[PDB]
Swiss-Prot record:
Function summary: Required for ribosomal protein bS1 (rpsA) to bind to the 30S subunit.
Residues found modified as N6-succinyllysine: K107
Protein name from the UniProt record: Small ribosomal subunit protein uS2
Subunit details: Part of the 30S ribosomal subunit, contacts bS1. Some nascent polypeptide chains are able to cross-link to this protein in situ. In collided ribosomes contacts ribosome rescue factor SmrB.
Signal sequence annotation: none
Disulfide bond entries: none
Family per record: Belongs to the universal ribosomal protein uS2 family.
Stretches that traverse the bilayer: none
Residues represented out of the complete protein: 9 to 117 of 241
Top-rank taxon: Bacteria
Length: 109
RNA sequence: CUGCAUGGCUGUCGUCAGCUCGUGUUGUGAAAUGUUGGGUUAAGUCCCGCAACGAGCGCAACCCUUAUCCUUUGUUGCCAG
């Protein structure tokens, strides 16, 4: 059991064959995801994430695709949150030894 | 005396636009990318666009000279009021 929203899809011939073990078939000329084989994955995700949050762990939200570049920063305003929504460019995490100076370099401005 | 032994100095290209690094990326690695591409120039310039983002030196401005004006000042020079 998992509730899922209404599907219409887009790009009727475009899919990645690395998703094959999680594709249920095709309906309305788009390939569709399996919403039963993914339930033990969703039921783990809500629990292992709440465990990191219960250890005060810093959760970083990502939405660089323009469809999500507002949703990532507009889903809450009564909570505190960390987000990235502009191009990663030289990188952020493997390049954190630069970002830790980029924030100081910004705060002087 | 030895620069075919050396710290350097000067000559060459040439005031040419280039040499190199931090971290990310590519490559088995020696190495590359960044520094390319597309507009535009004296110019790795100035922009746009990107697996790059910034940075040191050279480029360039600041700096020196001057056109026309403004402003201060002096002798045994100038002399209007």
């Amino acid at each position: 059991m998992l509730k899922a929203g209404v599907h219409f899809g887009h790009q009727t011939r475009y899919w990645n064959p690395k998703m094959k073990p999680f594709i249920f078939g095709a309906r309305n000329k788009v390939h569709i995801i399996n919403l039963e084989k993914t339930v033990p994955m969703f039921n783990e995700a809500l629990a292992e994430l709440n465990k990191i949050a219960s250890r005060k762990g810093k959760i970083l939200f990502v939405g660089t695709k323009r469809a999500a570049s507002e949703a990532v920063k507009d889903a809450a305003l009564s909570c505190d949150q960390f987000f990235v929504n502009h191009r990663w460019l030289g990188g952020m995490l493997t390049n954190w030894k630069t970002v830790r100076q980029s924030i100081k370099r910004l705060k002087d401005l």
